[PDB]
Amino acid sequence: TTIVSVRRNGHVVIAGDGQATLGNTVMKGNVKKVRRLYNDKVIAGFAGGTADAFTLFELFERKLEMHQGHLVKAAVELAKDWRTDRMLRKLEALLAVADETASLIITGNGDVVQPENDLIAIGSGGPYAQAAARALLENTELSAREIAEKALDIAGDICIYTNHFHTIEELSYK
Amino acid sequence: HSEMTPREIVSELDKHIIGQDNAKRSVAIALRNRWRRMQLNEELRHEVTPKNILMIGPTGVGKTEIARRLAKLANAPFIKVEATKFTEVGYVGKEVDSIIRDLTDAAVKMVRVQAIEKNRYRAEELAEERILDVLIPPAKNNWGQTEQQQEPSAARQAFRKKLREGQLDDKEIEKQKARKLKIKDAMKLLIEEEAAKLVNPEELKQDAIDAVEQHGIVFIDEIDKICKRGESSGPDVSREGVQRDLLPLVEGCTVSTKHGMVKTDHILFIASGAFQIAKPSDLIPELQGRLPIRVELQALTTSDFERILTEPNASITVQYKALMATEGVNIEFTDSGIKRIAEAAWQVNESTENIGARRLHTVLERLMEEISYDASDLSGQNITIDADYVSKHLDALVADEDLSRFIL
Numbered sequence: 001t002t003i004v005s006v007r008r009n010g011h012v013v014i015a016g017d018g019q020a021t022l023g024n025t026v027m028k029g030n031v032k033k034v035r036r037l038y039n040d041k042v043i044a045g046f047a048g049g050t051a052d053a054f055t056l057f058e059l060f061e062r063k064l065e066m067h068q069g070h071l072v073k074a075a076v077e078l079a080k081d082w083r084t085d086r087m088l089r090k091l092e093a094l095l096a097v098a099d100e101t102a103s104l105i106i107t108g109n110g111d112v113v114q115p116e117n118d119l120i121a122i123g124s125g126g127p128y129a130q131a132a133a134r135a136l137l138e139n140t141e142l143s144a145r146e147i148a149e150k151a152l153d154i155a156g157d158i159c160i161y162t163n164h165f166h167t168i169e170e171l172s173y174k
Numbered sequence: 175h176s177e178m179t180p181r182e183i184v185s186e187l188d189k190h191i192i193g194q195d196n197a198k199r200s201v202a203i204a205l206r207n208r209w210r211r212m213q214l215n216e217e218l219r220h221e222v223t224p225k226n227i228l229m230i231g232p233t234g235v236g237k238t239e240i241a242r243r244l245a246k247l248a249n250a251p252f253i254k255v256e257a258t259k260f261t262e263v264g265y266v267g268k269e270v271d272s273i274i275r276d277l278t279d280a281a282v283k284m285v286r287v288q289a290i291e292k293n294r295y296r297a298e299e300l301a302e303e304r305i306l307d308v309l310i311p312p313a314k315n316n317w318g319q320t321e322q323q324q325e326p327s328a329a330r331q332a333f334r335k336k337l338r339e340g341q342l343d344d345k346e347i348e349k350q351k352a353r354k355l356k357i358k359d360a361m362k363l364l365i366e367e368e369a370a371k372l373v374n375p376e377e378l379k380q381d382a383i384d385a386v387e388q389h390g391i392v393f394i395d396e397i398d399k400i401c402k403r404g405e406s407s408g409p410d411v412s413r414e415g416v417q418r419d420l421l422p423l424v425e426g427c428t429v430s431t432k433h434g435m436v437k438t439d440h441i442l443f444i445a446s447g448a449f450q451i452a453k454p455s456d457l458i459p460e461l462q463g464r465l466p467i468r469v470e471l472q473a474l475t476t477s478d479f480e481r482i483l484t485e486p487n488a489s490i491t492v493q494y495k496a497l498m499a500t501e502g503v504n505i506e507f508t509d510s511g512i513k514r515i516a517e518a519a520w521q522v523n524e525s526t527e528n529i530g531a532r533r534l535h536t537v538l539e540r541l542m543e544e545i546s547y548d549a550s551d552l553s554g555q556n557i558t559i560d561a562d563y564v565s566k567h568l569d570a571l572v573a574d575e576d577l578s579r580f581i582l
């Protein structure tokens with residue numbers, strides 16, 4: 001799977017493919033890996049169980065309700081329980097989350113990470129996307145959306161675990 | 175408590191009592207002194223004691239009324255004991271301490287009811303939220319925009335606006351409750367439910383004590399009935415006994431109530447007598463001392479009777495009008511009708527036994543017996559009670575003395 005988030009000109013995106021693999025075969029081809037949260041203010045993508053998500057994305061929402069839209073903090077509190085709560089601990093995944101403020105990754109380890117330029121590339125195809133994303137972002141005027149897209153295609157072309165079904169979620173603000 | 179001046183006190187007392195200006199001022203000086211005391215230093219506050227009053231006058235002229243309105247006007251605990259109630263304790267009976275006890279049980283049955291007034295909006299505001307929560311079970315952890323839990327106040331404000339009379343819709347809520355029920359009940363079960371939360375104990379019951387000690391008013395009727403009379407001796411020591419028994423109360427002592435420990439040192443005492451047989455100086459020395467204020471009340475005149483009939487706020491005449499209105503009946507008293515109602519009352523009192531303004535209540539009540547019964551079958555009418563009516567109804571009764579001893 002490949003999750004690619006980019007941010008350019010008051011525009012932030014999160015894109016992902018829809019391949020789920022079991023061994024050496026494709027189980028599903030259209031998995032929605034990029035949803036939306038906090039009254040459609042906060043976008044997010046992810047790699048993991050369809051349920052793990054639905055539990056880690058619901059909790060996150062409330063945390064925002066407990067920290068007035070302030071992304072980071074809710075994120076900090078999220079990654080917190082996620083490595084503390086006996087139950088919550090078994091959940092495995094990589095949440096990519098971005099709001100008009102910033103964008104970051106979260107790991108079951110409780111880590112909250114803000115990558116170099118709000119550029120995020122998690123998943124087995126992660127680095128191939130990072131590479132193509134970094135290239136475009138540094139040598140062309142393309143838009144954040146155009147970036148993640150093309151970066152994602154490049155990924156699915158290299159990554160045997162990444163396909164070409166997309167799910168893009170933007171956000172404008174300026 | 176009240177910051178009213180004596181003059182303002184008397185004024186306020188004039189709204190319920192006709193005449194008896196001197197008693198008014200006496201009782202008013204008393205109230206203003208309680209204020210005057212709290213404006214003093216440490217030492218002088220222990221020293222200064224209530225200036226207890228001794229009201230002297232014939233039955234039903236306003237002694238108790240004056241004392242009752244005074245109490246009412248200072249939201250003070252009030253008790254009225256009949257002095258002879260204890261002349262029998264030499265054989266058994268109520269101990270005089272009961273006075274301070276009762277003045278406490280009512281100083282409680284008072285702070286309690288007046289805690290239902292202060293807390294009658296809490297259960298129908300920050301507590302009616304019970305039904306609305308089972309009507310629209312709030313979001314899984316409200317967000318938080320200090321107007322977010324006010325956002326609904328659309329879907330929400332609709333259930334509140336519709337909850338202006340439309341109920342009997344059974345639901346359930348939560349020892350909290352849980353049990354399934356209606357609303358003519360889930361709602362009322364909530365009325366008290368959420369209310370006993372704000373009102374605590376060691377303050378409600380602690381304050382009753384505070385009231386009694388600070389604003390208590392004891393009215394001791396027939397104090398003259400326990401003075402010494404020259405007919406015997408055995409009953410005299412019993413009488414004087416009640417005086418000695420009452421002594422601790424007005425001189426300063428501590429009584430035990432099942433609500434705490436009350437201190438009488440600042441209770442205001444208004445004693446009352448007629449003093450036809452005895453004279454205030456027949457009271458024991460220690461009591462006369464503690465009864466510094468002496469005031470007489472005059473007997474009432476036919477003019478006072480006319481005035482009592484209509485001037486007071488919620489005078490018997492006014493009440494009557496109100497009550498008949500309940501029947502859709504417009505009652506009206508002409509100046510001459512009232513003049514005659516008073517006249518009759520005076521006649522009976524003079525011809526039989528004098529019972530003061532009390533006599534007005536029975537005369538007035540007999541005069542109206544007929545309208546009061548037919549009120550429902552007279553709806554929408556204007557009945558006028560004029561001199562004619564009065565005479566046709568009371569003349570024969572007043573004229574016949576033996577009859578008056580029964581019917582009036």
Ligand SMILES: Nc1ncnc2c1ncn2[C@@H]1O[C@H](COP(=O)(O)OP(=O)(O)O)[C@@H](O)[C@H]1O
Pocket residue numbers: 190191192193194232233234235236237238239240482486530531532
């Ligand atoms: N001066 C007065 N002004 C108004 N009402 C009076 C007056 N005197 C007597 N009454 C009426 O008559 C009844 C007699 O009781 P009260 O006034 O306490 O006098 P007493 O203590 O002598 O019995 C009361 O209900 C009161 O309404």
